[PDB]
Symmetry: D2
Subunit: 262 residues, 4 copies
């Protein structure tokens, strides 16, 4: 099959990449970083995130694998010592799919609606001023949020920034998204739900500005300043990310290993 | 159809019940509190909870309706003023189904395994002593919990005790259950996940005692002392509760009305 | 000086106690467990807690020391290896004082007001039914609390149950007490402050029942069922606990060692 | 006495200011906005904050008063209807003092150490990149913090941004400061205390960069980008803010009115 390998860029990951390429040379495998079918990431979850967004227009044609040259990652969950055994089995596997989050940003006249895909989460903050947005759920006005910002998370993203904000961890088999608050203002006049909210497929969460229309929007690692925003729309994506599965590594064990002990 | 009406017992709910019965007398409706097909609760969510557990062996044969004579309930979500219009449409509807939580309690020799169905949540605390349990997820040892106790919640139960413990609110269309912690002990030697955990259908969460085998187990309102416990097992029930739907009252609007404003 | 040693009761702590007694025999030290001036605890914070309440009517005449035969305790903060060097310096020190919490329980006719001293915290829960109390601060009605219960903590108790409820850690030099909530119910009709509250010396926090007058009150380890309660009053005690200081072991380092790493 | 009045700038506050000035003209009072002894703020807590920082080099010579033309403020806690009765009593009072927070920012060669005074809080975030700092308490290395940032709060600031981050509310008579975390990263390799920390007078909390030396530092409303930072130091200020007291308005009642009900 066609394949490519991305590297964190340090010495450990570059040599590992060069050794796997050499191992792949002993099989019917063609290196192609334009239309690969197997994408291998060597580094951390950040390296895997970059590999995902690098190829996010061929997600239905690609199965990802992550190798962690540092600590255990949630996406890079195979040790460097398994690389050789990984080359062999990649050459001759099952696939598991995780849900993704779609963000739609609409603007006033002059700019076209832009859409982004997130594997971890999409957050909105203000640009300088105070963050105030009306939160609309399936066209129902739910609340007026005042605070630092909001975070909408994928299931596999619940162990990342979502977790730091008090969000719940969701098994990635659940097709959903989770909205969490960042330092809500709650008094007698300002009211938010406080609790995290978990939304099923086909529920649209819409943030609508009340005064300032400039927001700092971050999709996974990338953070962009958007100007003259009319609406931010969240929903579970119809696209899914595909992982090549070469052994049983249960999500709850991955959670245990990363947070309890290993 | 066969029907019955349960009342909170106060004057307001008894008269409302008597008026609806009289209204039902003007239609082909037979009062039967043994094998009803329509079960109407008049009071609060507590009254509705009692009506649910009263008939939990015929859940596939019953459609529930709740009338709130006090504030808006999450299950009793129709005002007393709609009773007459409710009698008419009940006489001539759609059904919506919410998931339920199954709790299995196993003991040592002398007592048989007992199973309970919860509409809101099932909690475990200690009986006097300290609460320490090993949390096992699909036979994987996840953590050793020390604290006040644990709460496993249904989706519709997430707005109840789950919410008070920092849990997330889940739309009831998501077939899942949510485990929350009660005052976890976390230091350098004792470690819990801290975050709430959301489990899909067919994941089994198992609590296993480490020293004391006596626990206070509460299913919805009812709290029982169980002795010589060997295991407590949580999973999404295969049974579902059925609601008669006579108008659109979205869950997220029900959340807004109960917590933000009405 | 007069002295006594209490032991956890296991083999390790009993031998350690017997060796220190033998070491004390080589100095002008008289064992007296009725009117000691130096009270040594060997075990954990639980053993130290028992030693405190055992002698809480002579707190101004006693300097405490704790030896931890298990992990580092916040009160038993000297390793067993320092016992011999501890015997020598005890024989020939400075004193540091931590604030205490006073709880007053008032009843109806038939029972006299009872007062308790806490080194860690004093908590109130319901007895079976729901917990609802009016919280009164210096005779000002502050809130009506509904939930599992409330916890009032000393400064040195902030690392114990207070910490598990989201409370803040306070340096023990601050003469104060901290009230934390246990699973507050907050909706459109029920409102609590949510945040922990820190009170200075001479502020009186008063819990007043609204329906049930039976509460389970726990002072440190001891939990008592009180019946026909008219008021529960919290305030910083005028009494202080005295520790014999034989080296610099800063509180913030004790916190670091117990929760970050050692 | 010498006095001045600052206004929110809207129509309601400007007329109120003009009426009080006219009322002051009927007494021996000289308007002076250079060396006033009584500083009156008309607007919200933001207007009062600006009045504080406008005159923060004569805090020992000034007694502040706040009038809230909108909702009740924690510093602007007198209604516009009391303005006339306020002019009379200002003309003929007691003073109460709240503690302040001092922030010291040190840089590399080229820039001198800068110090700031906060009435509410001082926060540190990163500038673009990830926020990682070593937290040092009285020269003791306490933790390495990774997250969004940290917030150090005054006692009267505990009801503001501190409260939104889970901090405790402290009565302003307690001379202390409170450090809270902003979205801490906690796994098996990264550890923070999680709990808020309350520090007494003379404890120095020092943030030390580990990689990036550029931080966005906010003192009350003002947020500055500081470059090439070597250290950020927090401590309770020796200066105090003085309020003119014309009636009993207890802090806990002010908390009740702003968050529970009024
Ligand atoms: N999916 C995830 N689940 C849990 N943790 C995650 C996840 N992704 C990332 C990331 C990243 C780079 O942008 N991280 C952590 C890794 C350690 C540094 C902080 O971020
Ligand atoms: N499903 C629920 N979602 C949100 N809130 C709920 C739910 N059920 C109950 C209940 C009950 C009686 O046991 N409650 C609240 C009602 C107010 C008194 C506290 O409990
Ligand atoms: N002052 C304290 N600061 C932090 N932790 C504390 C404190 N006291 C105690 C206790 C006790 C026995 O009742 N503990 C912990 C020790 C581990 C078991 C749980 O309780
Ligand atoms: N000391 C304070 N205690 C509680 N709340 C506070 C405090 N100061 C401020 C402010 C400000 C302007 O920068 N606020 C609130 C007012 C409503 C808008 C959000 O900030």
């Amino acid at each position: 099959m066609k394949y490519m390998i991305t590297s964190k860029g340090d010495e450990k990951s570059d040599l590992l990449r060069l050794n796997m390429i050499a191992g792949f040379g002993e099989y019917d495998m063609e290196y192609d970083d334009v239309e690969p079918e197997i994408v291998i990431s060597i580094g951390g979850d950040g390296t895997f995130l970059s590999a995902f967004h690098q190829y996010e227009e061929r997600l239905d044609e690609i199965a990802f694998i992550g190798i962690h040259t540092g600590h255990l990652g949630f996406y890079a969950d195979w040790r460097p010592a398994e690389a050789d055994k990984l080359v062999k089995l990649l050459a001759k596997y099952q696939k598991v799919s995780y849900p993704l989050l779609k963000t739609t940003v609409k603007y006033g006249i002059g700019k076209k609606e832009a859409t982004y895909l997130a594997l971890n989460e999409s957050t909105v903050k203000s640009s300088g001023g105070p963050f105030v947005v009306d939160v609309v759920i399936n066209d129902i006005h739910f609340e007026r949020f005042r605070g630092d910002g909001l975070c909408m998370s994928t299931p596999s993203g619940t162990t990342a920034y979502n977790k730091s904000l008090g969000g719940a961890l969701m098994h990635p088999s659940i097709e959903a998204m989770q909205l969490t608050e960042m330092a809500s203002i709650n008094n007698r006049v300002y009211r938010t739900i406080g609790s995290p909210l978990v939304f099923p497929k086909h529920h649209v969460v819409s943030l609508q500005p009340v005064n300032d229309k400039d927001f700092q929007i971050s999709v996974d690692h990338l953070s962009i300043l958007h100007r003259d925003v009319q609406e931010i729309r969240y929903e579970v994506s119809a696209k899914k990310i595909h992982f090549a599965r070469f052994r049983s590594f249960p999500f709850w064990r991955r959670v245990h290993d990363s947070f309890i002990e290993d």
